Swiss-Prot record, chains A, B, C, D:
Protein name: General control transcription factor GCN4
Residues of the full protein shown: 251 to 278 of 281
Signal peptide bounds: none
Phenotype of null mutants: Abolishes recruitment of the mediator complex to the upstream activating sequence (UAS) of amino-acid starvation responsive genes. Decreases RNA level of genes involved in amino acid biosynthesis and cofactor biosynthesis during amino acid starvation or methyl methanesulfonate stress. Growth dependent on amino acid supplementation. Sensitive to amino acid starvation. Sensitive to purine starvation. Decreases cellular glycogen levels during glucose starvation.
Species of provenance: Saccharomyces cerevisiae (strain ATCC 204508 / S288c)
Post-translational modification: Phosphorylated by the cyclin-CDK PCL5-PHO85.
């Protein structure tokens, strides 16, 4: 549970990296 | 079960980011 | 203990990638 | 242990994303 929580946080960071990468792509 | 699911989502996000960056590289 | 360590390395890698992409954005 | 292993794999993917990002930076 401590672990699953940190996993969820991890995955939210990867969704935020995905956003950054979609943005740089749309701008081009 | 939940943890495993999250681990697999995480990894699969990492494969996508990796391939989006390699694709980017290539068009540039 | 090991797991926690790895979780913290992982998260900290994600913060760095996020900030390297935001920095990139900004210079572009 | 199954978990720590997958964490190690996760982190190796983040080192590989880091490489991709150092490369795109050196090329500029």
């Amino acid at each position: 549970k401590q672990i699953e929580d940190k996993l969820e946080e991890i995955l939210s960071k990867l969704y935020h990296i995905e956003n950054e990468l979609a943005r740089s792509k749309k701008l081009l």
